[PDB]
């Protein structure tokens, strides 16, 4: 007859706890670039957690930092999906 007050929240973090997150001055952040791309391609079919999983793979595999400063060069990133959701989420409805 009741549900947790923390239920039904989904926090799609661009990076893992304790880590930097990368942003390209010309193309935008790796995470947002990937999120929008996966939503555009799969929101008409896939459940949200599965779309976010593809975002994780895209960010993890297609991006690597490039910097003249060796300290910021060749770095990688993995997003972090935090779900307190209680049901599957689809951005469409079947009439």
């Amino acid at each position: 007859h009741k549900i947790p007050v923390e239920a039904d929240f989904l926090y799609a973090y661009s990076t893992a706890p304790g880590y930097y997150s990368w942003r390209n001055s010309k193309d935008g952040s790796w995470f947002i670039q990937s999120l929008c791309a996966m939503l555009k391609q799969y929101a008409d079919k896939l459940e949200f957690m599965h779309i976010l999983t593809r975002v994780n793979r895209k960010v993890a595999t297609e991006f690597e930092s490039f910097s003249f400063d060796a300290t910021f060069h060749a770095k990688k990133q993995i997003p972090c999906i935090v779900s307190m959701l209680t049901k599957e989420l689809y951005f469409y409805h079947h009439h």
């Binding site: 549900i3 947790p4 007050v5 923390e6 239920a7 039904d8 929240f9 989904l10 926090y11 799609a12 973090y13 661009s14 990076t15 893992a16 706890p17 304790g18 880590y19 930097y20 997150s21 942003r23 390209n24 001055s25 010309k26 193309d27 935008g28 952040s29 995470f31 947002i32 670039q33 999120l35 929008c36 939503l39 555009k40 929101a43 690597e64 910021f72 060749a74 770095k75 990688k76 990133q77 993995i78 959701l85 049901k87 599957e88 989420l89 689809y90 951005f91 469409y92 409805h93």
Partner: protein, 141 residues
Amino acid sequence: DNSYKMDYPEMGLCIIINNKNFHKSTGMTSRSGTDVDAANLRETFRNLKYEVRNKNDLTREEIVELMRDVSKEDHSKRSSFVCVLLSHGEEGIIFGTNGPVDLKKITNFFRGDRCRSLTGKPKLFIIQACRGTEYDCGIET
């Protein structure tokens, strides 16, 4: 009963907080490229039928105020809620143009007991911001 009800009259709001310019004291440099993110998100969620509202360079006080006000709206006819935060950050923290705000303070306004018109509905917070100063050096595959 395995899927959230998404056939309400409106998909819901998509609040985008786009912070690019910060006060010197923060030591944070201009977030070049964030406008590209904001535009991309606006179009992406517009296509998903979300009522997008973009806000630029908000102080930490303004972020809290915006969040409070939005949480006090009547979301009865909305299927869900989306908030996108684009800024500098630290673990558990998002930056207003003038300083840090605990993410918990922002999300608390939407708790199942504090925003009744959203109880039982998906509340999504998309966060593009650092969560510390560690680098992932990766591993060759």
